[PDB]
Amino acid sequence: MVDAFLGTWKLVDSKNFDDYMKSLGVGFATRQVASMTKPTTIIEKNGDILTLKTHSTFKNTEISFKLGVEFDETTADDRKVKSIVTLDGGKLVHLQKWDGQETTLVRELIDGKLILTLTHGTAVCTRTYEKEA
C-alpha cells in the first residue's frame, strides 16, 4: 500500500509550477523564490498515520493524517483547507477543498521516481522527486 512512498525525496524536475501557483493567487515575489527552491519531502508512517514534511530554504510545512479521514490543513501559501489523502489506483491522492475551490496533489511512482502532479483550475504541474541516495 503506501510503503513504497516512504522516505526522503529531493526535487529533480519541475514543469508548470508557476502556472499552478498563479492559479492559486500566489504573488509574484513568492513565485519567483519558489521557482528556484528545491524542497526535500519526507514521508513517514506510524500505523495508518502518515506524516508528510516538506522542507526548503523558503517555506516549510508538515501534515499528519490518517488515510481516508478528513483533516484541517494550512498550506504553504496560507490557504486554510479541508483535506483528505487516500490511495487510488496506486496513487497517493491529496484533495484540498476551500471556498468551493478544489486542488489535487497526486503522487505516483514511475521508474523509482516520485511524480507529484498538482492540478488547480486548468493548471497542471508535474514535479519529479528522487529518493535521497
Ligand X SMILES: CCCCCCCC/C=C\CCCCCCCC(=O)O
Name the site residues for ligand X (rule: CB under 6 A).
Answer: 11, 21, 26, 30, 34, 37, 39, 41, 54, 56, 58-61, 75-77, 116, 127
119 labelled as ligand-binding? no
CB of 24 within 8 A of CB of 120?
yes
Rounded-to-integer distance, Cα 81 and Cα 97, Å: 5
Query: Helix count (H) and strand count (E) of the chain?
Result: 2, 10
51 annotated ligand binder: no
CB of 8 to ligand X, least distance (A): 13
Nearer residue to ligand X within complex by CB, 76 or 93: 76
Amino acid at 14: S
Closer Cβ to ligand X, 47 or 52, answer by number: 52
* 122 is known to lie in a ligand binding site: no
H-helix or E-strand containing 98? strand 91-98
- Binding-site members are 127-129
Query: Which residues make up each annotated binding site for hexadecanoate?
Result: 127-129
